[PDB]
Design an enzyme around this catalytic site. Structure first.
Site, PDB file in Angstrom:
ATOM      1  N   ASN A   1      -8.602   4.663   2.958  1.00  0.00           N
ATOM      2  CA  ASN A   1      -9.271   5.592   2.060  1.00  0.00           C
ATOM      3  C   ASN A   1     -10.243   6.449   2.816  1.00  0.00           C
ATOM      4  O   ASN A   1     -10.843   5.957   3.731  1.00  0.00           O
ATOM      5  CB  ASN A   1     -10.002   4.832   0.988  1.00  0.00           C
ATOM      6  CG  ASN A   1     -10.595   5.758  -0.033  1.00  0.00           C
ATOM      7  OD1 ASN A   1     -11.762   6.105   0.025  1.00  0.00           O
ATOM      8  ND2 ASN A   1      -9.793   6.178  -0.987  1.00  0.00           N
TER       9      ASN A   1
ATOM     10  N   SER B   1     -11.406  10.978  -3.301  1.00  0.00           N
ATOM     11  CA  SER B   1     -10.911  10.348  -2.078  1.00  0.00           C
ATOM     12  C   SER B   1      -9.404  10.332  -2.110  1.00  0.00           C
ATOM     13  O   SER B   1      -8.812  10.548  -3.155  1.00  0.00           O
ATOM     14  CB  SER B   1     -11.397   8.959  -1.907  1.00  0.00           C
ATOM     15  OG  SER B   1     -10.728   8.107  -2.806  1.00  0.00           O
TER      16      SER B   1
ATOM     17  N   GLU C   1       0.837  -1.197   0.000  1.00  0.00           N
ATOM     18  CA  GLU C   1       0.000   0.000   0.000  1.00  0.00           C
ATOM     19  C   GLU C   1       0.879   1.256   0.000  1.00  0.00           C
ATOM     20  O   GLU C   1       0.619   2.156  -0.749  1.00  0.00           O
ATOM     21  CB  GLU C   1      -0.845  -0.001   1.245  1.00  0.00           C
ATOM     22  CG  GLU C   1      -1.964  -0.989   1.136  1.00  0.00           C
ATOM     23  CD  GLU C   1      -2.975  -0.624   0.063  1.00  0.00           C
ATOM     24  OE1 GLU C   1      -2.873   0.496  -0.532  1.00  0.00           O
ATOM     25  OE2 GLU C   1      -3.804  -1.506  -0.251  1.00  0.00           O
TER      26      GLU C   1
ATOM     27  N   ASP D   1     -15.542  -3.936  10.412  1.00  0.00           N
ATOM     28  CA  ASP D   1     -16.698  -3.506   9.595  1.00  0.00           C
ATOM     29  C   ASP D   1     -16.907  -4.458   8.427  1.00  0.00           C
ATOM     30  O   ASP D   1     -17.411  -4.013   7.384  1.00  0.00           O
ATOM     31  CB  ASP D   1     -16.535  -2.062   9.152  1.00  0.00           C
ATOM     32  CG  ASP D   1     -17.062  -1.151  10.226  1.00  0.00           C
ATOM     33  OD1 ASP D   1     -17.548  -1.657  11.228  1.00  0.00           O
ATOM     34  OD2 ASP D   1     -16.963   0.061  10.040  1.00  0.00           O
TER      35      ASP D   1
ATOM     36  N   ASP E   1      -6.119   8.057  -0.168  1.00  0.00           N
ATOM     37  CA  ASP E   1      -5.592   6.931   0.603  1.00  0.00           C
ATOM     38  C   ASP E   1      -4.458   7.401   1.485  1.00  0.00           C
ATOM     39  O   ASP E   1      -3.553   8.068   1.025  1.00  0.00           O
ATOM     40  CB  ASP E   1      -5.132   5.817  -0.307  1.00  0.00           C
ATOM     41  CG  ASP E   1      -6.181   5.446  -1.330  1.00  0.00           C
ATOM     42  OD1 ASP E   1      -7.361   5.371  -0.937  1.00  0.00           O
ATOM     43  OD2 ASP E   1      -5.808   5.276  -2.510  1.00  0.00           O
TER      44      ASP E   1
ATOM     45  N   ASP F   1     -11.307  10.227  -7.565  1.00  0.00           N
ATOM     46  CA  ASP F   1     -12.715  10.071  -7.152  1.00  0.00           C
ATOM     47  C   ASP F   1     -12.968  10.994  -5.962  1.00  0.00           C
ATOM     48  O   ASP F   1     -13.990  10.800  -5.264  1.00  0.00           O
ATOM     49  CB  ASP F   1     -13.014   8.606  -6.876  1.00  0.00           C
ATOM     50  CG  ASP F   1     -12.263   7.994  -5.706  1.00  0.00           C
ATOM     51  OD1 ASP F   1     -12.506   6.807  -5.446  1.00  0.00           O
ATOM     52  OD2 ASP F   1     -11.436   8.687  -5.084  1.00  0.00           O
TER      53      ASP F   1
END
Length: 129
Positions: A59, A50, A35, A101, A52, A48
């Site tokens: 994100n 967003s 990542e 989640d 990271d 978009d």
């Protein structure tokens, strides 16, 4: 801060990631390696709207609030900048949240693409733990 894999392993292990929801430490280190290249300050600003953030490129649409992302849920209830700390705790906690989640580590595209089905123990191998 750019972690070494073993130092990140040790930190992630202190933060209880080893076997967190069945994901071995290596998975998390590997996720971080792909990542962010263990760069706590990693940011990827997406088209978009967003971003990271951090060593686990969490994100900002769902997980953290950077204030500029449409559809912010901030499910980790943290500012995204908290994910850019040299300490991984926020990222770890938010990573745990992400898994808690009902997302596997598939939540991390780098994990899915570069760690899933790999020798993720390689990322902690030869480390003091």
């Amino acid at each position: 801060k750019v972690f070494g894999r073993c130092e990140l392993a040790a930190a992630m292990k202190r933060h209880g990631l080893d076997n967190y929801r069945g994901y071995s430490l290596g998975n998390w280190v590997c996720a971080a390696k792909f990542e962010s290249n263990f760069n706590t300050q990693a940011t990827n600003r997406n088209t978009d709207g967003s971003t990271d953030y951090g060593i686990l490129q969490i994100n900002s649409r769902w997980w953290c609030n950077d204030g500029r992302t449409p559809g912010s849920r901030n499910l980790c209830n943290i500012p995204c900048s908290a994910l850019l700390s040299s300490d991984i705790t926020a990222s770890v906690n938010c990573a745990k949240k992400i898994v808690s989640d009902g997302n596997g580590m598939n939540a991390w595209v780098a994990w899915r693409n570069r760690c899933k089905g790999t020798d993720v123990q390689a990322w902690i191998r030869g480390c003091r733990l």
